Amino acid sequence: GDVEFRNVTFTYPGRDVPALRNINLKIPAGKTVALVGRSGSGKSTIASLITRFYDIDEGEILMDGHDLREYTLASLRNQVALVSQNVHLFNDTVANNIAYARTEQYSREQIEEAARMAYAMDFINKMDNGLDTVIGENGVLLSGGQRQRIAIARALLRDSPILILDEATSALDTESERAIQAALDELQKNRTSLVIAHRLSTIEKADEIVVVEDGVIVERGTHNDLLEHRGVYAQLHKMQ
């Protein structure tokens, strides 16, 4: 899947200044682009606009060369796998949440394999009816990290053309979490991936790194080229 922002400006409802200004961003099919910058710089806004929680003020977002606003909502949800705290949950079983409410389109074994590959099966097993426990209402509320791993499992299961990855819980070390990064690394390979970077070390391998400051893209390049550029990214290379 191809994703392109053309002269995109966006302002959160009620705000008086834009969150994004004249964003031009091309992510060709199969490439990974890492967005870096301070929290509140607009990097998360860029990724989240693809989900159409809001519409842009001006400009164009194109998906496979078609404006986002031309897709039916069903087609939009099918194209994009969101791995973030805003992954959409259903008042339904865990298995049905991993399957994105698509029933009898996946097998039980596929759902279970996706759960294990996301390292979600450990906490799922502690629920009374396992994968078939009803989450949400009159049921279990997911912790934040549990919700992320449900999102990883859903993304692993669906094999979607577009991945939006918010690398939350940058504090990572142990075994089940080290292999989470390994699972994410394989998922973003062979897929158009927009990654919200929260630790710089995790995105040195992106095909292009994009530095956002105050809603403006200030620098673009590979990790090595950006270091030789001795600009903003090179200065941010002080957190290591």
Epitope: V211, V218, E219, R220, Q235
Partner: nanobody
Framework: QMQLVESGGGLVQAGGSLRLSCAVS????????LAWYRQAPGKPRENVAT???????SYADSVKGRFTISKDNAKSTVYLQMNKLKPEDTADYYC????????WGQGTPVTVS
């Protein structure tokens, strides 16, 4: 569409000085990173000097103490003051905006005899 237009290049003898200019239209000039790169006939295109939002500057080691990058928000122009020019500075000099995968001028030639 963004345009970067260099000027000021030419022929100078060793020890001479040259000031390059680059007019930038279509950019959020005060915020994006600006830079000068250069490329000699056999070598790849390499960074010379870089200036970020607050006019914070950086330089390649071979150029420190001789070259100076600066920017003018009012004129939306970026400049490269080249003093104490060495023959090894002979190259095509390129203006750049938004980093090495960003936008590029078409260069201005510099020859140091």
């Amino acid at each position: 569409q963004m345009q970067l237009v260099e000027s000021g290049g030419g022929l100078v003898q060793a020890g001479g000085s040259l000031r390059l200019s680059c007019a930038v239209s279509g950019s959020i000039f005060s915020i994006i990173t600006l830079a000068w790169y250069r490329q000699a006939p056999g070598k790849p295109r390499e960074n010379v000097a870089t200036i970020t939002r607050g006019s914070r500057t950086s330089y390649a080691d071979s150029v420190k103490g001789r070259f100076t990058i600066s920017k003018d928000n009012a004129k939306s122009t970026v400049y490269l003051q080249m003093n104490k020019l060495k023959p090894e500075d002979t190259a095509d000099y390129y203006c750049n905006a938004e980093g090495p995968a960003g936008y590029w001028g078409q260069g201005t030639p510099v020859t140091v005899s």
